Each structure stands twice: as C-alpha cells, then as structure tokens.
Enzyme design. Structure first.
Site, PDB file in Angstrom:
ATOM      1  N   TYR B  26       0.828  -1.194   0.000  1.00 21.37           N
ATOM      2  CA  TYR B  26       0.000   0.000   0.000  1.00 21.37           C
ATOM      3  C   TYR B  26       0.867   1.250   0.000  1.00 21.37           C
ATOM      4  O   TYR B  26       1.910   1.293   0.653  1.00 21.37           O
ATOM      5  CB  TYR B  26      -0.931   0.006   1.209  1.00 21.37           C
ATOM      6  CG  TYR B  26      -0.277   0.408   2.503  1.00 21.37           C
ATOM      7  CD1 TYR B  26       0.467  -0.493   3.237  1.00 21.37           C
ATOM      8  CD2 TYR B  26      -0.417   1.690   2.996  1.00 21.37           C
ATOM      9  CE1 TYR B  26       1.056  -0.126   4.419  1.00 21.37           C
ATOM     10  CE2 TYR B  26       0.169   2.061   4.173  1.00 21.37           C
ATOM     11  CZ  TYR B  26       0.902   1.153   4.881  1.00 21.37           C
ATOM     12  OH  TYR B  26       1.488   1.536   6.059  1.00 21.37           O
ATOM     13  N   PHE B  36       1.515  10.218   3.060  1.00 16.38           N
ATOM     14  CA  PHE B  36       1.787  10.137   4.488  1.00 16.38           C
ATOM     15  C   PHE B  36       2.393   8.814   4.928  1.00 16.38           C
ATOM     16  O   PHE B  36       3.005   8.768   5.998  1.00 16.38           O
ATOM     17  CB  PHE B  36       0.506  10.408   5.298  1.00 16.38           C
ATOM     18  CG  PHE B  36      -0.544   9.329   5.192  1.00 16.38           C
ATOM     19  CD1 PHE B  36      -1.624   9.482   4.346  1.00 16.38           C
ATOM     20  CD2 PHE B  36      -0.482   8.191   5.975  1.00 16.38           C
ATOM     21  CE1 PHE B  36      -2.596   8.508   4.258  1.00 16.38           C
ATOM     22  CE2 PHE B  36      -1.452   7.214   5.887  1.00 16.38           C
ATOM     23  CZ  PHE B  36      -2.508   7.376   5.029  1.00 16.38           C
ATOM     24  N   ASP B  37       2.242   7.749   4.146  1.00 10.90           N
ATOM     25  CA  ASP B  37       2.841   6.467   4.487  1.00 10.90           C
ATOM     26  C   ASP B  37       2.904   5.609   3.236  1.00 10.90           C
ATOM     27  O   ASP B  37       2.103   5.774   2.315  1.00 10.90           O
ATOM     28  CB  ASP B  37       2.050   5.751   5.584  1.00 10.90           C
ATOM     29  CG  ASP B  37       2.719   4.474   6.053  1.00 10.90           C
ATOM     30  OD1 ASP B  37       3.854   4.198   5.613  1.00 10.90           O
ATOM     31  OD2 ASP B  37       2.109   3.743   6.859  1.00 10.90           O
ATOM     32  N   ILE B  56      -9.001  -0.644   8.871  1.00 10.52           N
ATOM     33  CA  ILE B  56     -10.190   0.175   8.687  1.00 10.52           C
ATOM     34  C   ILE B  56     -11.168  -0.549   7.765  1.00 10.52           C
ATOM     35  O   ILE B  56     -10.770  -1.265   6.839  1.00 10.52           O
ATOM     36  CB  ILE B  56      -9.807   1.559   8.136  1.00 10.52           C
ATOM     37  CG1 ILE B  56      -9.126   1.425   6.777  1.00 10.52           C
ATOM     38  CG2 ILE B  56      -8.882   2.264   9.090  1.00 10.52           C
ATOM     39  CD1 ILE B  56      -8.916   2.733   6.075  1.00 10.52           C
ATOM     40  N   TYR B  82     -10.658   6.584   9.515  1.00  7.97           N
ATOM     41  CA  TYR B  82     -10.598   6.729  10.964  1.00  7.97           C
ATOM     42  C   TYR B  82     -11.758   7.543  11.524  1.00  7.97           C
ATOM     43  O   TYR B  82     -11.997   7.504  12.735  1.00  7.97           O
ATOM     44  CB  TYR B  82      -9.259   7.348  11.357  1.00  7.97           C
ATOM     45  CG  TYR B  82      -8.097   6.463  10.985  1.00  7.97           C
ATOM     46  CD1 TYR B  82      -7.556   6.499   9.712  1.00  7.97           C
ATOM     47  CD2 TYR B  82      -7.561   5.574  11.895  1.00  7.97           C
ATOM     48  CE1 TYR B  82      -6.509   5.686   9.362  1.00  7.97           C
ATOM     49  CE2 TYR B  82      -6.512   4.758  11.554  1.00  7.97           C
ATOM     50  CZ  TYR B  82      -5.992   4.819  10.285  1.00  7.97           C
ATOM     51  OH  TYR B  82      -4.944   4.006   9.935  1.00  7.97           O
ATOM     52  N   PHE B  99      -5.685   5.234  -1.365  1.00  8.97           N
ATOM     53  CA  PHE B  99      -4.678   4.188  -1.292  1.00  8.97           C
ATOM     54  C   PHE B  99      -4.381   3.643  -2.681  1.00  8.97           C
ATOM     55  O   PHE B  99      -5.152   3.831  -3.624  1.00  8.97           O
ATOM     56  CB  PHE B  99      -5.127   3.051  -0.368  1.00  8.97           C
ATOM     57  CG  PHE B  99      -4.935   3.343   1.091  1.00  8.97           C
ATOM     58  CD1 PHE B  99      -5.914   3.986   1.818  1.00  8.97           C
ATOM     59  CD2 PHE B  99      -3.774   2.978   1.734  1.00  8.97           C
ATOM     60  CE1 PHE B  99      -5.736   4.257   3.153  1.00  8.97           C
ATOM     61  CE2 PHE B  99      -3.592   3.251   3.065  1.00  8.97           C
ATOM     62  CZ  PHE B  99      -4.573   3.890   3.774  1.00  8.97           C
TER      63      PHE B  99
HETATM   64  C1  LIG Z   1       2.755  -1.231  17.108  1.00 13.95           C
HETATM   65  C2  LIG Z   1       1.303  -1.039  17.135  1.00 13.95           C
HETATM   66  C3  LIG Z   1       0.588  -0.401  15.974  1.00 13.95           C
HETATM   67  C4  LIG Z   1       0.376  -1.401  14.852  1.00 13.95           C
HETATM   68  C5  LIG Z   1       1.322  -1.048  13.755  1.00 13.95           C
HETATM   69  C6  LIG Z   1       1.699  -1.976  12.678  1.00 13.95           C
HETATM   70  C7  LIG Z   1       1.356  -3.430  12.758  1.00 13.95           C
HETATM   71  C8  LIG Z   1       2.459  -1.451  11.485  1.00 13.95           C
HETATM   72  C9  LIG Z   1       1.513  -1.085  10.350  1.00 13.95           C
HETATM   73  C10 LIG Z   1       2.278  -0.990   9.042  1.00 13.95           C
HETATM   74  C11 LIG Z   1       0.780   0.220  10.649  1.00 13.95           C
HETATM   75  C12 LIG Z   1       1.598   1.447  10.277  1.00 13.95           C
HETATM   76  O1  LIG Z   1       2.585   1.662  11.262  1.00 13.95           O
HETATM   77  C13 LIG Z   1       3.816   2.074  10.714  1.00 13.95           C
HETATM   78  C14 LIG Z   1       0.722   2.690  10.141  1.00 13.95           C
HETATM   79  O2  LIG Z   1      -0.167   2.526   9.064  1.00 13.95           O
HETATM   80  C15 LIG Z   1      -0.809   3.725   8.684  1.00 13.95           C
HETATM   81  O3  LIG Z   1       0.193   4.677   8.251  1.00 13.95           O
HETATM   82  C16 LIG Z   1      -1.763   3.436   7.529  1.00 13.95           C
HETATM   83  O4  LIG Z   1      -1.356   3.722   6.213  1.00 13.95           O
HETATM   84  C17 LIG Z   1      -3.036   2.908   7.745  1.00 13.95           C
HETATM   85  O5  LIG Z   1      -4.136   3.765   7.941  1.00 13.95           O
HETATM   86  N1  LIG Z   1      -3.257   1.599   7.745  1.00 13.95           N
HETATM   87  C18 LIG Z   1      -2.172   0.654   7.468  1.00 13.95           C
HETATM   88  C19 LIG Z   1      -2.606  -0.304   6.376  1.00 13.95           C
HETATM   89  C20 LIG Z   1      -3.941  -0.933   6.720  1.00 13.95           C
HETATM   90  C21 LIG Z   1      -4.998   0.140   6.903  1.00 13.95           C
HETATM   91  C22 LIG Z   1      -4.617   1.115   8.007  1.00 13.95           C
HETATM   92  C23 LIG Z   1      -4.776   0.457   9.359  1.00 13.95           C
HETATM   93  O6  LIG Z   1      -6.058   0.051   9.781  1.00 13.95           O
HETATM   94  O7  LIG Z   1      -3.806   0.258  10.130  1.00 13.95           O
HETATM   95  C24 LIG Z   1      -4.151  -0.449  11.306  1.00 13.95           C
HETATM   96  C25 LIG Z   1      -4.561   0.519  12.370  1.00 13.95           C
HETATM   97  C26 LIG Z   1      -3.733   1.742  12.609  1.00 13.95           C
HETATM   98  C27 LIG Z   1      -5.769   0.269  13.169  1.00 13.95           C
HETATM   99  C28 LIG Z   1      -6.489   1.385  13.858  1.00 13.95           C
HETATM  100  C29 LIG Z   1      -6.093   1.451  15.324  1.00 13.95           C
HETATM  101  C30 LIG Z   1      -6.745   2.669  15.958  1.00 13.95           C
HETATM  102  C31 LIG Z   1      -8.261   2.572  15.864  1.00 13.95           C
HETATM  103  O8  LIG Z   1      -8.825   3.785  16.305  1.00 13.95           O
HETATM  104  C32 LIG Z   1      -8.723   2.322  14.434  1.00 13.95           C
HETATM  105  O9  LIG Z   1     -10.110   2.078  14.429  1.00 13.95           O
HETATM  106  C33 LIG Z   1     -10.758   2.811  13.416  1.00 13.95           C
HETATM  107  C34 LIG Z   1      -7.991   1.149  13.793  1.00 13.95           C
HETATM  108  C35 LIG Z   1      -2.951  -1.269  11.764  1.00 13.95           C
HETATM  109  C36 LIG Z   1      -2.717  -2.423  10.804  1.00 13.95           C
HETATM  110  C37 LIG Z   1      -3.122  -1.831  13.163  1.00 13.95           C
HETATM  111  O10 LIG Z   1      -4.000  -2.927  13.084  1.00 13.95           O
HETATM  112  C38 LIG Z   1      -1.800  -2.317  13.745  1.00 13.95           C
HETATM  113  C39 LIG Z   1      -1.019  -1.184  14.367  1.00 13.95           C
HETATM  114  O11 LIG Z   1      -1.596   0.092  14.509  1.00 13.95           O
HETATM  115  C40 LIG Z   1      -1.590   4.345   9.835  1.00 13.95           C
HETATM  116  C41 LIG Z   1      -1.974   5.777   9.491  1.00 13.95           C
HETATM  117  C42 LIG Z   1      -0.815   4.317  11.145  1.00 13.95           C
HETATM  118  C43 LIG Z   1      -0.145   2.973  11.353  1.00 13.95           C
HETATM  119  O12 LIG Z   1       0.619   3.035  12.528  1.00 13.95           O
HETATM  120  C44 LIG Z   1      -0.203   2.925  13.668  1.00 13.95           C
END
Ligand SMILES: C=CC[C@@H]1/C=C(\C)C[C@H](C)C[C@H](OC)[C@H]2O[C@@](O)(C(=O)C(=O)N3CCCC[C@H]3C(=O)O[C@H](/C(C)=C/[C@@H]3CC[C@@H](O)[C@H](OC)C3)[C@H](C)[C@@H](O)CC1=O)[C@H](C)C[C@@H]2OC
Ligand SMILES: [NH3+]C[C@H](O)c1ccc(O)c(O)c1
Lengths: 352, 107, 428
Positions: B26, B36-37, B56, B82, B99
């Site tokens: 992605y 942003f990522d 998400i 989010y 994305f």
């Molecule tokens: C160490 C612990 C953190 C753990 C981190 C990893 C495994 C590394 C993994 C590459 C995440 C990245 O870390 C570098 C980074 O990916 C982003 O940049 C991104 O592009 C993104 O949006 N993605 C990632 C790709 C899948 C969709 C989405 C996501 O759903 O991600 C999921 C997410 C954040 C869930 C939220 C949690 C908060 C709630 O409020 C919300 O509920 C609505 C759901 C990820 C998979 C989580 O399951 C797992 C984690 O968070 C976020 C902008 C911030 C995130 O870092 C946090």
C-alpha cells in the site's frame, strides 16, 4: 535487557556546544563524521552557523558570475546519506567547485542536517561552492511538507525561523562561464534580457505570479516542436510552460549556449533536450541528483561536469540510511491507541 | 463509501477468502496526494487478515473486491476511514484517504 | 546483667531510628508515594522517631546507671518530650482514621476538597495542640504532690521517679489516651461497616457470578489457560501482559479479591491518573518502575509481528528513548512518560460498563493493624496507671516501668507493617 539486538549502531547522545565544530573556520570532517552517525548539535551553535551562512550569502550578487571548471548538481531533497556519495563522486570541495541548482529541504527526513552541512561547507569555502534557490525554500511549501515538523521535533522552532530568514537571501541566476545560464526552473515572459534579473530583489518570499515566481516554478514542454511560449501548466498550476522557440529566441537575443534546470526527475538522472541547430549543444539540460526519489521511483542520479569545453556526466547510485517513523512519531504515540483498543476489547469480552 | 478503479488489472480467477491473509504494497496519501505512508519506503509487504477487525473497514470492503495482481486505487470515505476521532500524529479528523493497494499473494 | 540490658537498649534505639528514617526517605524520595495518607504516615514516623531518639536512650541510661546525673531542668524537658510524643502519636492516629472514613464515605468530595496544604495545616494543628497540652502543665509544676519524699526527689537532682498530684494523672490519661482512643475505635468501626456494605452493592455479586462461571478448574483462581478458553480472547496479542497486571500477588493465579480490583481500575467515572498508570504498566515487563530498552522492544515486537524489519524497530526505539530521557538514566520513568503522552487524551478510550470505584480498599487492613497494635501496646500501661492512682498501689514501682518499656518498644512495629505492603516493600 539493555539492547535486544546490538548489531545496529547506537546514536551518540551528547550535543556539540560550539567548542569542537569551530576553531573562525568551522571544522568540517568531524561535523560530517558526527552527522553521519545520527548525532546532533546544540541550538546556539546551529543559530551561529546559519547566521554566518546568511551573512556570507547576502553579500553575494543576484546573478552569480562563475568561472569555468564547475561541477553542476541537481536537487537533493534532504537525502543526506546520498549527499556524501555525491561529494565522493564529484571530488571533494578541497580541489573542485560546485554549483547547487535546486532545493534541499522538503520530502526527506534528514534535511536540517543536510542544510547545516552545506552551510558550514559554504562558510569554510566562500568562493568555491555556489548555492542557488529552489521552489521548496518558502514559507508555504515547507510548512505544507515535512520540514517544519522536522525542525520542531529535532530542534526548537527558533531554528526553523532562522533557517527561513536565511533561505530568503540566496541568489537565483548564476551565469556560468559567460556561455551558460543556470536557473532552477526556467525562463519567464516578463524576463527577456539577462539584465532583467539583475534588478528585482530576492529578499522576499516568492509570490504566486511574476518574474521571480516564474523562474522557480516554470517547466518546459514534453513535446518540443509542438505546433504554434506562454501556455500555462497544469502539473504545477502556478507558472508557464515554454517551447523551443522561446529558448531559441532567448539564446539568440543574448549570446548563450544552454540553460540548465533541476525539476523533472530523470530515470537516467539527466536529459539533454532537442538539439540546437545554431551551434550544436542542446538548448535545455535537466539534472537530477537524488537517487531513489521518494524511495519508490528506483531511478539513478547524475552529476554534470564541465571542463575543457566538454560536458561529461557522472552517473550515481543510492545508499542505505536509518529509518524514521512517518511524521516523526515516537513509539508511545505510535502504538498507544492500539494498546487501548486491544485492552478494551479483551475486557469487554471477558466480563460477558 | 469505498470505490475500486483499477489501473493495471491482473488475473481475476482468484479472490480473497474470509479465512486467508492478504499481502499488499500500500502507498497511501490524503485526498490531495500528500503522501503520508508507504510500504515501499520499507522493503516489506503488509500482511493482514480479513474477518478480524483491525484494518479500517474501507480496506475490509475494498480489498475484498480485488484479485491476484490487480493494482487498484481506493477512495476511502470518512465513514470507513478513521472517522471523527482521526489518528494523533499523522491524520487530521474528517479525512478522505486514497490508497494504491496491490494484492500479490495469499497464504 | 547490666551489659546485656545496655546492648538490648542500644539495638532497640538503632532499629527504631533506622526504620523510621528509612520510612521517611521512602515516602519523601520516590515522589510517587506522596498521598495525603502518606503525609500523615510521615508525621507519625517523625513523632515516633523523635520519641525513640530522644527519650529511649536516656530512659535506658536511667534504668541502667541507677543514678540520673543529667539535671532537674533536663528531667522536666525529658518527661515533657515523652508526654508530647505519646499524645501526638495517638492524635495523628485518629486523624488518619477520620481521613479514611471521609475518603471511603464519598470518594469525590475527599478527592476534590482535601489538598496538600490542608494536610500540612491539619498536621501542624494537631502537633501544636498536643505540644501545648504536654509542655504547659509540666513546666508550670501542676503535678508535684505534698508527700515529703516526693519533695525530696524534686529537690534532689538524681531522683526523677515521676510523682503524680493525685489529679494530674486522671486529667492527663482522660485528655490524652481515653477520648482519642474511643473516637478512633468507633470511627474506624464505621469504616469497616461501610467497606463491608459497599463491597456487596448488588454489582459485585454479578461479577462474582461471572467469575465463578469462567472458573473451569474450580480451584478458586483463574489461570492463563482458562482465559484463552474464550474463543474471541485468544487471538488478542496483548492478553498475557494484562494478566500480569491483574496478577499482583505473583502466585500465577487471579482470584476474586484481585479480579474486581483489576477491573475496577477501569470505569466510566474512574480517575484519569489510574488509566494512565495502567497504560504505563503495560511496558514494565518486570514491574521494576522503569521502561528499559529490552522491555520497550519486546513489548512492541509482539504487536508489529513481522511487518517491520528487526533493525528498523530497534532504530526507532533507540531514537524514542534518546529523545525521551530528561535525566540521563537511559530508561523512561512515569514522569517522563506523562510528559510524552498526555494530550492524546487516551484515558477516554479505556472504558468498561462497570460502575464502582474500589480504590480506597487497598489500605484498610494495614491501618487497622497499626491501630490495634498501638492500642494493645499502650492500654495496659494506662490501666495500671488508673489502678495506681488510688494509693491502694496493689503492686507497683517495678511493674510500672516494664509497662512503660512495652509502650516504648512498639514504635518499631510500624515499619514492619509497612514493609508487609507490596508497594512499600518494593520501595525499600
Ligand atoms: C505497534 C502497534 C501499531 C500497529 C502497527 C503496525 C502493525 C504497522 C503497520 C504498518 C501500521 C503502520 O505503522 C507504521 C501505520 O499505518 C498507517 O500509516 C496506515 O497507512 C493505515 O491507515 N493503515 C495501514 C494499512 C492498513 C490500513 C490502516 C490500518 O487500519 O492500520 C491499522 C490501524 C492503525 C488500526 C487502527 C487502530 C486505531 C483505531 O482507532 C482504528 O479504528 C478505526 C484502527 C494497523 C494495521 C493496526 O492494526 C496495527 C497497528 O496500529 C496508519 C496511518 C498508522 C499505522 O501506525 C499505527
Ligand atoms: N513516662 C510517662 C508515660 O509515657 C506517659 C504517657 C502519656 C501520659 O499522658 C502520661 O501521664 C505518661
């Protein structure tokens, strides 16, 4: 324990308070070898470096007049660990001189270190390393991109303000060997003779329109020879295109040979445009010296070198670098929402 | 909600089951293209499992429509992104995301 | 023998001084055990340290040398310090009792109204009231009787056998150890009544029923394999950690006494500090009080799985720790954590439907033990004093001093009761 994996080096955790980096010639080799090591500097010494660099740059002309044996270079965009590779490829500044065309700061995680090294190197060598100004050196682009946050995290915001007040004084034309012109963008309809860029003051942030904004934002056509100058662009939406007749008329009215620029990323690193029938050198040359731009394009950089009336091009390659989290988030802010969500889920499930 | 408009579609004979893990590269941005990522700034694919609700919901109902090798381009609405709370550090509240996922393998 | 008694007194004084200074330092230094109750405890420790250091060695010298060659003035000063210390301790005990009653009967009012300044004000008020009650009658000579040998001991410098005025004894026992005694007894009895009633407010019973429904082993405690019985609780990454936060006794098992205390840490109206502390405790893999690099990397390695390389995770952890160290130790404390986090407003995301605050139940048995020990140690002397008022003097003069020494020695009992507590134990 203390370190689960130790094969990776440790960043030094002591700042340098102006006693070792200086002497008032600044020390360069130790500054490189400490910035190469993810080091850091004290705030006051950083202010001193940037202010001295601004003082030297302000006295410089507005249209730099450079001598022949130069080594032109493109836009870096914060890639410090490739900036050193540039310096070992094109010869260290001790013996050969440089002319940096483009911007330095946004779209990279090591931009403050890069500008600190470049301005210390300019302080030590004042007449053998010339710097120019690019579009990413304003108050709009840098705040929009990841430089303001970079200064806010690494240093204090006062460093950022000083850095902008010192970027606002760079030169912008840099004539070369009375044959070339070396601008970051390109020509402008309001600029017709070289003297026209000897008048306007460069001590203000570039506007959205006019002669200055069209010298740092312009962009040439992809289809030189197009059927019939001043057609607007959509990629930037802020300045004008310019076709082969415009450059040809500019080089016929003023006796020059070519213009150089540093916007359009080249997969080969450089590009020589359509051949000029008057003499035989290409009218427009595009440089680009940032390998693996945005870490995804997988291009390779290039460095032009002018000597003995011959332009020879040195190719380039990437280099590894440390890893920072996006937008400089510490691990607590990184993973705390996930911790809260998982704890809450497990508890709301165990109770019933 | 979420809309998939492919760029370089590939083979469509394989679809993601509910009990499998999908690996994707992605490269996300905001609505205006400000990246942003990305998963190519690192040399590592992103592996996620459906059914379990960690990604998400836009991914959950936007990656399911894909196949093997079919690069796509997701336009995640604030309902499936989010949402109102947003994410501290990176994403401001009430964000529409874009994305560039690319399903490669299934395990 | 004389040498043995001298050695015993020396050891007793050394133990009292060392223990009280240890408690004072433990409360003052760590900056986390600074509750108002802990400030009252500091006042009590100061009181019994003063009595130990000043009174006990000199009374020991009096009982050993058989002649007291220190002076009439010094005698008055010593007896007045003695009375002051006993009265001050007994009054601060009932202050603690009433404080705990107000803290249990309505947590929010005590949490909001009472501050550090009020604690200092009330401590100084009670100390000065006791000090006035002890200095004023002694120095003005209200207690000297008419018996001729009492007058002789008053005139002779060597003799300091306390002698009552047949009226000073009554007035001081019943203005110092009979009014505060009954007050601190029934107030704290009401404290136990309210605690026992609150522990069973129709809400904890439902949690107990669910607990007994979840307990497969039927052993009275929950093990980890029983928590992974829930089909949607097993896949959670950070389940183990939370168990180790509930398992505060270290035995490997969770039981109903600490299950509810763990769950009650999360509430709709719970304190923000409690939830932030719980968030901090996930990273303390050894409960040592500080977040090491190995802890902060092994906690993150079970969440990110294999989505980041090992080297990238180590590098970002290093940079975080280096930018978070505000004291150069190399490991983040809770203050540095609350400097980093705080503003995210994450305490609003840890909510469970339970509505009950069992916060003021963790420090009820130890204080009751302290009160019971003090009463058991000091009441026999006052009952013998009230028998001896009348010149019936059924048996006296060589029973009467051993009871004053039983009263003296109890000042070392408090630090042991404190070290029985877990947080104070790890503090020392
Ligand atoms: C160490 C612990 C953190 C753990 C981190 C990893 C495994 C590394 C993994 C590459 C995440 C990245 O870390 C570098 C980074 O990916 C982003 O940049 C991104 O592009 C993104 O949006 N993605 C990632 C790709 C899948 C969709 C989405 C996501 O759903 O991600 C999921 C997410 C954040 C869930 C939220 C949690 C908060 C709630 O409020 C919300 O509920 C609505 C759901 C990820 C998979 C989580 O399951 C797992 C984690 O968070 C976020 C902008 C911030 C995130 O870092 C946090
Ligand atoms: N040495 C006297 C004994 O300690 C004591 C304590 C408290 C009193 O009110 C008292 O009269 C005597």
């Amino acid at each position: 324990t203390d370190r689960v994996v130790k094969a990776v080096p440790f960043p030094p955790s002591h700042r340098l308070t102006a006693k070792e980096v200086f002497d008032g010639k600044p020390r360069v080799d130790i500054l490189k070898a400490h910035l190469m090591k993810e080091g850091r500097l004290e705030e006051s010494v950083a202010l001193r470096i940037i202010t001295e660099g601004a003082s030297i740059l302000r006295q410089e002309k507005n249209l730099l007049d450079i001598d022949a044996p130069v080594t032109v270079c493109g836009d870096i965009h914060g890639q410090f660990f490739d900036l050193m590779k540039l310096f070992e490829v094109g010869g260290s500044p001790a013996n050969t001189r440089y002319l940096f065309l483009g911007d330095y700061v946004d779209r990279g995680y090591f931009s403050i270190e890069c500008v600190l090294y470049l301005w210390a190197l300019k302080i030590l060598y004042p007449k053998t390393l010339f710097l120019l100004r690019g579009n990413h050196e304003c108050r709009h682009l840098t705040e929009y991109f990841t430089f303001k946050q970079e200064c806010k995290i690494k240093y204090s915001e006062r460093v950022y303000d000083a850095c902008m007040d010192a970027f606002d004084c760079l030169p912008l034309a840099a004539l070369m060997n009375q044959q070339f012109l070396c601008v970051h963008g390109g020509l402008s309809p309001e600029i017709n003779t070289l003297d026209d860029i000897r008048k306007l003051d460069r001590f203000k942030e570039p506007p959205a329109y006019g002669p200055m904004c069209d010298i740092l934002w312009s962009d040439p056509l992809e289809d030189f020879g197009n059927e019939k100058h001043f057609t607007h662009n959509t990629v930037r939406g802020c300045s004008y295109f310019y076709s082969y007749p415009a450059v040809c008329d500019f080089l016929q009215h003023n006796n020059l040979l070519s213009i150089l620029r540093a916007h359009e990323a080249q997969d080969a690193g450089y590009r020589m445009y359509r051949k000029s029938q008057t003499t035989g050198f290409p009218s427009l040359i595009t440089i680009f010296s940032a390998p693996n731009y945005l870490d995804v394009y997988n291009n390779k950089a290039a460095v032009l070198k002018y000597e003995n009336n011959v332009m020879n091009i040195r190719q380039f390659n990437c280099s590894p670098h440390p890893y920072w989290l996006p937008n400089f988030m510490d691990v607590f802010t990184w993973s705390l929402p996930f911790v809260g969500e998982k704890v809450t889920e497990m508890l709301v499930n165990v109770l019933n | 909600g979420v809309q998939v408009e492919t760029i370089s579609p590939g083979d469509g004979r394989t679809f993601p089951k509910r009990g499998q893990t999908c690996v994707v590269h992605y490269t996300g941005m905001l609505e205006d293209g400000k990246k942003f990522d990305s998963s190519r700034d690192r040399n590592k694919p992103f592996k996620f499992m459906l059914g379990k609700q960690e990604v998400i919901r836009g991914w959950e109902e936007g990656v399911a429509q894909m196949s093997v090798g079919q690069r796509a381009k997701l336009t995640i609405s604030p309902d499936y992104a989010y949402g109102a709370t947003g994410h501290p550090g990176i994403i401001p509240p009430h964000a529409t995301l874009v994305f560039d996922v690319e399903l490669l393998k299934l395990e | 023998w004389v040498v043995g008694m001298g050695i015993v007194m020396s050891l007793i004084v050394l133990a009292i001084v060392f223990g009280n200074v240890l408690v004072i330092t433990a409360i003052a230094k760590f900056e986390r055990l600074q509750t108002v109750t802990n400030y009252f405890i500091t006042s009590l420790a100061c009181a019994d340290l003063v009595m130990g250091l000043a009174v006990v060695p000199f009374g020991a010298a009096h009982i050993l040398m058989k002649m007291w060659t220190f002076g009439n003035f010094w005698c008055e000063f010593w007896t007045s310090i003695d009375v002051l210390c006993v009265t001050a301790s007994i009054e601060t005990l009932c202050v603690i009792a009433v404080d705990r009653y107000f803290a249990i009967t309505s947590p929010f009012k005590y949490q909001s109204l009472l501050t550090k300044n009020k604690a200092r004000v009330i401590i100084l008020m009670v100390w000065i009231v006791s000090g006035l009650t002890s200095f004023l009658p002694i120095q003005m000579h209200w207690y000297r009787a008419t018996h001729q040998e009492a007058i002789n001991c008053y005139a002779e410098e060597t003799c300091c056998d306390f002698f009552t005025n047949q009226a000073y004894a009554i007035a001081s026992s019943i203005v110092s150890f009979y009014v505060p005694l009954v007050i601190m007894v029934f107030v704290y009895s009401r404290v136990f009544q309210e605690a026992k009633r609150q522990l069973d407010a129709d809400e904890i019973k439902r949690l107990g029923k669910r607990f007994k429904k979840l307990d497969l082993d039927n052993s009275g405690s929950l093990s980890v394999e029983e928590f992974m019985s829930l089909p949607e609780l097993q896949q959670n990454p950070l389940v183990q950690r939370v168990i180790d936060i509930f398992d505060t006794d270290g035995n490997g098992e969770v039981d109903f006494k600490e299950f509810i205390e763990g769950v009650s840490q999360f509430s709709v109206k719970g304190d923000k500090e409690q939830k932030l502390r719980f968030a901090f405790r996930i990273y303390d893999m050894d409960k040592d009080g500080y977040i090491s690099n190995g802890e902060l990397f092994q906690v993150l390695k079970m969440m990110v799985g294999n989505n980041l390389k090992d080297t990238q995770l180590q590098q970002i952890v290093d940079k975080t720790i280096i930018n978070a160290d505000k004291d150069g130790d190399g490991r983040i404390s809770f203050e540095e954590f609350c400097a980093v986090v705080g503003g995210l407003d994450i305490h609003k995301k840890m909510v469970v439907d339970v509505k009950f605050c069992l916060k003021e139940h963790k420090a009820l048995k130890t204080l009751g033990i302290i009160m019971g020990t003090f009463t058991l140690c000091w009441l026999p002397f006052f009952i013998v004093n009230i028998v001896h008022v009348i010149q019936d003097n059924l048996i006296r003069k060589e029973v009467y001093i051993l009871l004053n020494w039983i009263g003296y020695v109890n000042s070392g009992f408090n630090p042991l009761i404190y070290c029985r507590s877990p947080d104070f134990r790890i503090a020392f």
